[PDB]
């Protein structure tokens, strides 16, 4: 009993062209049983997008939490937190309970409202930064993402092109993984617009 | 590890290897072994390497601020911080120390606190692995108030046999002089203990 | 085990709770009500480790009255929710976790909607159509995906939990002593006297 | 010992009041007067500055009106360093709140809350009060709009059109004489730029001494905290300046 | 990982891998692991990653703090003992390895710190997991004097036979040289010897691959 | 045992901080330190008045970097102010830099040590600062700012202004002679001029401290090799600069 | 102003703590007891006031030990001293644990002068109201101490504090002068029973009972032990017979 | 009244227990300068025995904080020890934690730190004692700083203490005018104890003997203090002048 | 008169006025008077009413089987002091299996009631104490002032009017020490003590307490009819 084993999910982020691209499996299980069909893992804080795999309690109260820092830190700092500074916050968060930790993998995704630059980013259960300019995969088909993500991607995708690639990558991983699946959404974000899809799995 | 602290007419001389290994790995094979917690009161440690670091450097400070109010601490005084840190901590510590000191009054002076913090005055100490080696030469060879140069050479030779006989010690043999003229410190490379 | 089952049925929310207190090889009691009202227009059924059910349950109770009375305002089911996860992930990493599972029926008046939520021991809510906790899942939920239907009336839902329970005696190994049914809408929480 | 300097700021008069408390009021009778409006379709808070220069930078000035979370601002009036600490404490105990409901806070309990703060630093502690008073304008779909005023003394009512600061007898009647229930944001807007005008104790009404603030109406509440430029424009509208 | 740090006739340098795999998959291909504690007192790191980072970072801001307060330029001793002291403190229970260099007032200096607090001196070492064969090219190929170029040289050779004879190390060579006297010089993929090779074919789906279910636009406004 | 666990600063029957103000006068006693924002920068300039001339005056600092794009200066007791960079430079990791991984903005610090102060204004047992701080800072997305914080824990945002004994009269003059199209060199030049009425004695680089918030220096980062740290943004004008731009006045 | 002699630890304008002064008012109205420092150690003497009769003889015992080498006596209130010596006791044992060897005079001596300053440093404290003189031989030799309510500590050749403190100190000062050499031990507790029968001279209202205590290497191996017996009796003779 | 007895502010904004205690610096009536050399730094005090009882190798006000620095402080000797106890601890600490011996400039600033919060807290008072520490840093050469009851801290070419420390103040401004340097160019620490006592006896009119002089002297790694013997040989050596 | 508001404050003169306010309240407290010889110690205590219908209190309490003291003035500081007193014994009787002597316990109230004399808060105690024992060292007979003086006395007297009982104790200290072997002797000469302060008063059954400890006697309390053949 793997606490980051027991709901399953996976999360995937990728960059192209002026915008990234961040996706997630939509199923909640008790081990084999599947409970919840729709179980996001994706939250957006203004323009900051975290997609949070692993343990389904801990993915809620880090969403919550995040929420709790991202709206004070607009309060006090009367600007939205960019991607970079929100990729440091959730380290920092994640590292402060080093040895009561959570078991959750967050990726955080977004444009730099300044620069314009994609910028994603992965996280251990201690928050160690992996910041990789190409994709971020996470949950317990890590591996088949990984192998789908290097397979596929190519740099400097437009986002009808990036949203098939890291569709056909989300969904080709879930196949081959048993606690994931149930149906996927699909965040395509550009610096003025956000296109959420729901794609259509194979539900077993 | 091999260590050894022997006193003598003149004052006292401090010897060691310098290999620190993690298992069958030579991690580090020119450690300095010997460290000195005062002018004249120096100790030779064996065990978790943390734990002796750690217990020298607070030793080193304690010795420090009594210098600064009490003036200058016997050797008796360095071993009894020793054995109140290693004994009120005794649960999670694995250090073997010998302390030796030179003060005008007493000549040389060798104490060792072994695993447990018991302290013991000797006139010569050996800790570490390759010590288990050496107890009959040393036992048979010893001899209290020695000259300088026979003093280097008994420690010359005990902790060559030992590096010979115990693989977790080797390296150069580094060596430590407390006396009246003050430190002196001597080295011996392999190359030279080895044909003894 | 215990049986506690929900679903949610267009216009209210229908709560099933298991009878049977078992400890040992002895039924202890074959009438126990394992549900408390925490509010005229939320339920929560609960089961899991002896002792803990019932002090959680009676703990949330007191707390969403408290907050009632306080705001002369009744709590939407949604922040009745929120507020037990929140409990029950604090619960997780406490020294002595809440071992209690709950299902959360109400009939937010506002929305005028009926809801029901699932929580575990470790503080995972999800809102579901139908809901089951333990190993009364692994029968109704398959049951339920084929025959619910989110148009339902209430007596369409009695039935449907009529069927769910025939075959939970059926295939659990367990005789749960019947069930007590509840049902919660927009005039409150009643229990059905009359079933099967 | 250190008795002989405790000024025992938590005691009672022979009257049955707390000096410290009384004394707060009247600091904070000297402060910018800051005026809340509640109509049928918005709140509306203006504030006048006391510090006031030309070389004073304006743009990035708050020092009258601010957030308390997305649905609820605060007109301050008295202390700005101890007004900012019971802003933030306020603002932590709304994210707590949502965090533990998943909803908004109301706007009576965040008032109630803050005002249980100042009122237990006048009862308990041996600490002087805050000297500020506070004017909750805010939102939520039980009570609608609602204005909301707390003192240092802890106690906190509902208004429908209220002032706190400098010259409030002034401004609370000029508010009866020409306030009317079915009005409107911007008729608030007006009447609260025209008491300002009338109840301020320099020469003119000019945008730089002065802020603004406006919870409206998308389906959603938008709250809007007036910049220098839009505060010379409703000035120019509505009749204060040319 | 595999980490060196070598010095020379006029300062110090250290050199790393730039490969962090999580078990048998690799991560990054390209993680920086040389962090900075002082604008010239640098550190390699190894073991758990986030320890790693969390204590260069620790340490590096109260070494800022004591330089604003001291109004010194801060040694490289003192970041060792703040290292080993709240290494020790855990009991090993921080997994960060560490190799120290940098230069000073003092002059230049290169320590290796443990994660349960032990620390070692000398001319040339080596850390992570190819550490054994970047030691071996050490002691086969390491002498006093050295030049900067040298010292540069030896650090990169080291590294390579750890990306190369070495599982857990790959990719590319980050090196930073700091002398008595000038600037750090960050010298990031200073080798790339590791190119992955263009593929067969392009696997870019034609727009419409994906079977679509439902399609919105969300607000990321105010 | 601190038995001063009340309030030394109460209201007065009149509605005065008694304690509040002693300190603000206290601050009006101090030596004249001015500020002035410029567009491409900001400037802060003091007195070094020293006590006995056998004093090294380099070892008496009145501007002391904050930040590696904030500095301040400040009118009033000397130790406060001193005590005060020390704290403010503490929580500028411990309350930002540990947590986002960079600076705070100048907004926030300001903010800080304002919380700071005005915990010293109602703690128990304890004096207000004797201290009005001048902060100037920058940050990427307000720009540069310039902030004066009293005693009483307020802060207030300034295009520019003066705080000490000749305070009134600097103000007077900045409020002549400052435009928003001012450069950060047409700032110092303001500055100086603005000092030299304020002061009376030696006029040269040894006599007064200036320091400016502007450009980024890359040959002050201490480490090449990271194109995106630029530098810091702070810089304590030398002695022969301060001369250079004195003898053309 | 007014008041600053109500609080402790408040400066007065001419620089002063008038409530250290006070207690150096109440050390003055207190037994006169002394210390001389001879050649291998020191000794301590002190005057019991024998108000009645009815005060059982020999007991009472004011001077005190610390450590086994440490004398202090105390002149003043009896119960300040008897406080600070538990203080001074716990420094020595908290030495003796951590360093092994006995704490010199001269650490023992800052302990207590630490302790003394510290109670004369917050209004929440009354300073000290005892005059204190100590002392013992260590490595380094014989030492003696007084250490005033103030906080400050001198080593002195001879130290004298009470009401006939005056003439003890006189008395003292012939010592030096006519003894550079240094007295021995027998002979530096002879003198102090004479200087004790000099200083009671100040309060003849009533007897007395001599008190005294050495510290000697050659005469107690460096142990502080009470003059009792034959010896205390022949010091008592030889006083009475070099008074009047 | 009570504005007077606490360190709060009068209504001119001062702190009148600051300046008392001040005033108790002067109580012992020593005076003490301190000077550099080319790599040294020289301290004399004046040693005031006035008892015949005392011991006058118990009788001082300077103090070795460390092995580099030392310390003399003008004022009462309770917080003269006191001070000097809480430097000592302080700068073992500092060697413990950051494993260089501790800088000049840096005891003066956090002892003058702990002046300052001694002024801003109530329930404690101000020590009324100035301390000159003097050292030889590693970095910045010889090195004299002092530190004040109010918390103010700051270095000097030469200083001077004590109730007639301003006549040696000037006579120090007046040779350095002369010299025009910062400093004694001496490369003997012997030369500079020398032209410490001669300007002092220049200043204060009054010869002085082996048993009325304290003196500190900081070399390189080393702060030591001078014996009546030593202080003897010095004087003899100014007098074959 | 400005120096009397707690213990922290010492006056001009040197006096610490706190502590004699707490010595006024003892002499105000009824007389009880203590000798002893060198076999056996008496306290005899004269109980003090309020009215004919009130009871006379108690002045003595047994703090161990060889230990025991009287009290004059505040009961509860006496109760305090006493229990304390019994605690140390009770420590020494269990860890070292050593009945505490009555010096040391003489020390450690001292130390309990100086503890009062210099922290601000805390007022000095309101009772002054007479604390007879029979150790190894033989019969004891201590007087506690609360100002922490302690003083070992063959006999002594604490309350009002104990003056004359003093002068009586003084008068017959050659005749009063020497009564060893003859318990009841000695408690008559302590009544008779007692009586020396009898001003307007009469000592009755009811009036008089008397407590005996020696060499195989333990501190034992004789109250109403038992104290009658000494009357
Ligand atoms: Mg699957
Ligand atoms: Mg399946
Ligand atoms: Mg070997
Ligand atoms: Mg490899």
Request: aromatic content about 8%; proline content about 3%; overall charge negative.
């Amino acid at each position: 009993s793997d606490p980051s084993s027991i709901n399953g999910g996976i999360v995937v982020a990728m960059t192209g062209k002026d915008c990234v691209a961040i996706a997630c499996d939509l199923r909640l299980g008790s081990q084999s049983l599947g409970v919840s069909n729709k179980f996001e893992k994706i939250f957006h804080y203004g323009h900051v997008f975290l997609g949070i795999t692993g343990l389904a309690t801990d993915v809620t109260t880090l969403n919550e939490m995040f929420r709790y820092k991202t709206n004070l830190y607009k309060l006090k700092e009367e600007r939205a937190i960019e991607p970079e500074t929100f990729t440091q916050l959730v380290s920092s968060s994640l590292y402060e309970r080093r040895f009561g930790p959570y078991f959750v993998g967050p990726v955080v995704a977004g444009i730099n409202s300044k620069s314009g630059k994609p910028f994603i980013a992965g996280f251990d259960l201690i928050g160690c930064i992996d910041e990789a300019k190409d994709f971020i995969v996470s949950g317990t088909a890590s591996d088949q993402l990984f192998g789908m993500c290097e397979s596929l991607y190519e740099p400097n995708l437009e986002p009808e092109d990036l949203f098939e690639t890291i569709s056909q990558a989300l969904l080709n991983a879930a196949d081959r993984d048993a606690l994931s699946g149930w149906g996927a959404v699909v965040y395509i974000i550009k610096k003025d617009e956000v296109v959420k899809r729901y794609l259509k799995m194979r539900q077993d | 590890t091999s260590i050894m602290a022997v006193t003598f007419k003149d004052g006292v001389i401090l010897g060691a290897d310098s290999r620190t290994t993690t298992g069958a790995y030579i991690a580090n094979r020119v450690t300095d072994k010997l460290t000195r917690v005062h002018d004249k009161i120096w100790c030779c440690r064996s065990g978790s390497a943390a734990d002796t670091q750690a217990i020298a450097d607070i030793v080193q400070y304690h010795l420090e601020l009594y210098t600064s109010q009490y003036g200058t601490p016997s050797t008796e005084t360095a071993a009894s911080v020793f054995k109140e840190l290693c004994y009120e901590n005794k649960d999670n510590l694995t250090a073997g120390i010998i302390v030796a000191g030179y003060d005008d009054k007493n000549k040389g002076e060798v104490y060792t606190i072994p695993l447990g913090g018991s302290v013991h005055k000797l006139p010569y100490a050996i800790a570490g692995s390759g010590s288990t080696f050496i107890y009959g030469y040393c036992d048979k060879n010893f001899r209290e108030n020695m000259s300088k140069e026979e003093t280097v050479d008994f420690i010359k030779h005990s902790l060559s046999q030992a590096i010979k006989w115990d693989g977790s010690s080797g390296g150069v043999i580094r060596m430590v002089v407390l006396t009246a003229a003050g430190v002196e410190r001597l080295i011996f490379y392999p190359d030279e203990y080895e044909q003894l | 085990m215990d049986i506690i089952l929900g679903i949610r049925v267009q216009d209210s929310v229908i709560l099933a709770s298991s009878k049977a207190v078992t400890r040992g090889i002895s039924v202890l009691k074959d009438s126990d009500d394992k549900t408390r009202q925490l509010s005229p227009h939320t339920l929560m059924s609960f089961a899991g480790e002896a002792g803990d059910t019932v002090q959680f349950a009676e703990y949330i109770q007191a707390n969403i009255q408290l907050y009632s009375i306080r705001e002369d305002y009744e709590l939407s089911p949604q922040a009745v929710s929120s507020f037990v996860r929140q409990e029950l992930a604090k619960s997780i990493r406490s020294r002595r976790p809440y071992q209690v599972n709950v299902l959360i029926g109400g009939y937010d008046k506002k929305k005028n909607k009926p809801e029901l939520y699932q929580i575990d021991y470790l503080g995972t809510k999800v809102e579901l159509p139908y809901g089951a906790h333990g190993y009364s899942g692994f029968y109704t939920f398959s049951l339920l995906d084929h025959h619910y239907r989110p148009d339902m009336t209430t007596e369409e839902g009695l039935d449907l939990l009529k069927l769910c329970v025939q075959e939970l005696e059926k295939r659990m190994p367990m005789d749960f002593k019947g069930v007590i049914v509840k049902i919660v809408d927009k005039d409150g929480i009643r229990q059905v006297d009359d079933f099967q | 010992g250190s008795r002989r300097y405790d000024s025992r700021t938590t005691i009672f008069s022979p009257e049955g009041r707390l000096y410290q408390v009384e004394y707060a009021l009247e600091s904070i009778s000297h402060a910018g007067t800051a005026i809340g409006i509640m109509a049928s379709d918005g709140i509306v808070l203006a504030a006048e500055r006391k510090v006031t220069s030309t070389l004073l930078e304006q743009d990035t000035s708050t020092e009258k009106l601010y957030k308390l979370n997305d649905k609820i601002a605060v007109a301050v009036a008295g202390l700005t360093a101890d007004a900012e600490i019971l802003i933030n404490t306020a603002r932590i105990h709304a994210q707590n709140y949502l965090k533990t409901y998943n909803e908004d806070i109301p706007v009576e309990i965040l008032v109630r809350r803050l005002s249980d703060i100042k009122q237990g630093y006048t009862q308990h502690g041996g600490l002087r009060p805050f000297g500020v008073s506070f004017i909750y304008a805010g939102y939520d779909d039980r009570y609608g709009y609602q204005l909301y005023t707390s003192n240092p003394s802890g106690n906190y009512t509902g208004w429908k059109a209220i002032s706190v600061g400098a010259n409030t007898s002034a401004a609370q009647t000029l508010l009866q004489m020409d306030y009317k229930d079915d009005m409107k944001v911007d008729d608030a807007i007006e009447l609260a730029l025209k008491t300002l005008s009338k109840t301020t104790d320099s020469s003119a009404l000019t945008y730089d001494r002065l802020e603004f603030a406006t919870i409206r109406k998308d389906g959603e509440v938008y709250q809007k905290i007036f910049k220098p430029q839009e505060i010379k424009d409703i000035l120019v509208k509505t009749g204060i300046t040319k | 990982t595999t980490i060196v740090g070598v010095k020379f006739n006029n300062g110090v340098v250290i050199a790393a891998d730039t490969r962090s795999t999580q078990g048998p998959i690799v991560a990054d291909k390209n993680c920086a692991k040389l962090h900075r504690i002082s604008p010239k007192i640098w550190c390699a790191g190894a073991g758990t990653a986030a320890d790693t980072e969390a204590v260069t970072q620790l340490i590096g801001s109260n070494i800022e703090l004591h330089s604003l307060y001291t109004s010194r330029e801060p040694r490289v001793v003192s970041a060792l003992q703040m290292l080993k002291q709240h290494l020790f403190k855990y009991q090993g229970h921080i997994g960060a390895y560490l190799i120290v260099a940098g230069v000073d007032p003092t002059g230049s200096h290169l320590f290796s710190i443990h994660a349960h607090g032990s620390t070692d001196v000398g001319y040339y070492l080596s850390l992570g997991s190819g550490s054994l064969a970047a030691m071996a090219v050490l002691e086969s190929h390491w002498k006093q004097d050295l030049t900067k170029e040298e010292a540069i040289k030896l650090a990169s050779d080291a590294i390579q036979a750890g990306i190369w004879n070495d599982l857990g190390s790959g990719s590319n060579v980050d090196v930073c040289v700091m002398e008595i006297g000038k600037d750090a010089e960050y010298l990031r993929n200073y080798l790339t010897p590791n190119v992955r090779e263009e593929k067969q074919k392009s696997y870019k789906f034609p727009r419409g691959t994906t079977a679509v279910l439902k399609e919105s636009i969300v607000n990321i406004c105010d | 045992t601190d038995r001063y666990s009340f309030s030394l600063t109460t209201f007065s029957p009149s509605g005065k901080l008694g304690q509040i103000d002693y300190a603000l006068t206290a601050v009006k006693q101090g030596v004249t330190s001015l500020g002035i924002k410029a567009t491409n920068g900001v400037v802060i300039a003091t007195e070094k008045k020293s006590s006995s001339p056998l004093a090294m005056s380099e070892t008496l600092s009145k501007v002391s970097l904050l930040t590696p794009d904030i500095g301040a200066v400040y009118s009033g007791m000397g130790p406060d102010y001193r005590v005060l960079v020390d704290k403010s430079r503490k929580v500028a990791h411990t309350s930002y830099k540990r947590i986002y991984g960079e600076y705070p903005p100048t907004k926030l610090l300001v903010s800080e040590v304002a919380k700071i102060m005005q915990e010293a204004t109602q703690s128990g047992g304890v004096r207000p600062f004797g201290v009005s701080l001048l902060i100037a800072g920058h940050d990427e997305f307000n720009g540069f700012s310039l902030y004066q914080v009293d005693p009483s824990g307020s802060y207030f945002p300034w295009k520019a202004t003066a705080i000490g004994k000749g305070s009134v009269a600097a103000k007077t003059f900045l409020e002549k002679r400052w435009n928003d199209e001012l450069e950060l060199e047409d700032a110092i030049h303001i500055a100086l001029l603005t000092l030299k009425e304020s002061v009376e004695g030696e006029f040269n680089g040894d006599t007064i401290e200036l320091a400016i918030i502007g450009d980024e220096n890359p040959d002050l980062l201490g480490y090449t090799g990271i194109p995106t740290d630029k530098g810091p943004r702070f810089r304590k004008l030398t002695s022969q600069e301060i001369n250079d731009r004195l003898e053309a006045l | 102003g007014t008041g600053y002699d109500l609080s402790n630890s408040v400066f007065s304008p001419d620089g002063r703590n008038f409530q250290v002064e006070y207690a150096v008012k109440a050390v003055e109205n207190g037994t006169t007891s002394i210390g001389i420092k001879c050649n291998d150690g020191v000794v301590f003497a002190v005057e019991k006031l024998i108000t009645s009769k009815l005060l059982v003889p020999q007991k009472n015992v004011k001077i005190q030990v610390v450590d086994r080498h440490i004398g202090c006596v105390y002149s003043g209130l009896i119960p300040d001293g008897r406080h600070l010596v538990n203080r001074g006791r716990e420094e020595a044992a908290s030495f003796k644990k951590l360093y092994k060897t006995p704490i010199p005079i001269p650490a023992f001596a800052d302990r207590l002068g630490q302790y003394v300053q510290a109670h004369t440093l917050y209004n929440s404290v009354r300073p000290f109201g005892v005059s204190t003189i100590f002392g013992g031989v260590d490595k380094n030799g014989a030492h003696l101490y007084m250490l005033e309510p103030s906080g400050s500590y001198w080593g002195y050749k001879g130290a004298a504090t009470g009401k006939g403190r005056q003439s003890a100190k006189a008395e003292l000062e012939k010592l030096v002068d006519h003894h550079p050499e240094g007295l021995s031990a027998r002979e530096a507790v002879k003198q102090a029973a004479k200087i004790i029968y000099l200083a009671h001279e100040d309060n003849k209202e009533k007897d007395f009972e001599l008190e005294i205590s050495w510290c000697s290497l050659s005469e107690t191996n460096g142990l502080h032990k009470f003059v009792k017996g034959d010896l205390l009796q022949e010091a008592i003779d030889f006083a009475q017979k070099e008074i009047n | 009244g009570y504005d007077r007895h606490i360190t709060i502010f009068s209504p001119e904004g001062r702190l009148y227990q600051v300046e008392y205690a001040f005033k108790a610096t002067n109580q012992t009536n020593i005076n003490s300068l301190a000077v550099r050399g080319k790599d040294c730094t020289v301290v004399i005090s004046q040693k005031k025995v006035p008892d015949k009882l005392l011991d006058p190798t118990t009788v001082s006000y300077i103090f070795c904080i460390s092995r580099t620095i030392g310390m003399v402080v003008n004022g009462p000797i309770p917080d003269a020890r006191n001070a000097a106890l809480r430097a000592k601890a302080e700068a073992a600490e500092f060697r413990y934690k950051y494993g260089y011996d501790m800088p000049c400039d840096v005891l003066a600033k956090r002892m003058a730190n702990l002046s300052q919060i001694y002024t801003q807290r109530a329930y404690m008072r101000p020590l009324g004692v100035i301390l000159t520490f003097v050292s030889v840093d590693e970095e910045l050469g010889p090195s004299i700083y002092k530190t004040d009851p109010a918390g103010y801290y700051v270095g000097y070419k030469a200083t001077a203490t004590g109730p007639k420390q301003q006549e040696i103040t000037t006579n120090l401004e007046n040779h350095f005018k002369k010299s025009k340097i910062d400093h004694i160019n001496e490369e003997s620490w012997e030369k500079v104890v020398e032209f410490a006592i001669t300007h002092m006896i220049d200043a204060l009119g009054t010869e002085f003997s082996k048993n009325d002089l304290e003196v500190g002297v900081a070399t390189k790694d080393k702060f030591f203090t001078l014996s009546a013997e030593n202080i003897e040989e010095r004087l003899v050596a100014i007098a074959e002048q | 008169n400005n120096y009397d508001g707690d213990t922290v404050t010492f006056s001009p003169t040197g006096r610490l006025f706190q502590v004699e306010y707490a010595l006024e309240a003892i002499k105000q407290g009824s007389v009880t008077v203590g000798l002893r010889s060198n076999t056996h110690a008496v306290l005899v205590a004269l109980k003090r009413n309020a009215d004919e219908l009130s009871s006379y209190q108690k002045k003595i309490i047994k703090c161990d089987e060889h230990m025991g003291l009287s009290l004059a003035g505040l009961a509860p500081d006496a109760r305090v002091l006493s229990n304390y007193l019994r605690q140390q014994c009770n420590y020494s009787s269990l860890v070292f299996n050593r009945k505490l002597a009555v010096e040391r316990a003489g020390h450690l109230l001292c130390d309990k009631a100086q503890k009062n004399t210099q922290s601000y808060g805390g007022r000095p105690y309101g009772v002054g104490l007479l604390i007879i024992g029979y150790d190894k060292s033989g019969a004891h007979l201590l007087e506690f002032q609360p100002s922490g003086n302690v003083t070992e006395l063959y006999g002594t007297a604490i309350g009002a009017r104990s003056q004359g009982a003093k002068t009586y104790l003084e008068r017959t200290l050659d005749t009063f020490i020497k009564i060893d072997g003859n318990p009841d002797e000695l408690i008559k000469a302590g009544v008779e003590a007692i009586s020396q302060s009898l001003r307007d008063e009469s000592l009755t059954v009811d009036n008089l307490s008397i407590a005996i400890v020696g060499k195989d006697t333990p501190f034992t309390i004789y109250d109403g009819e038992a104290v009658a053949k000494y009357i």
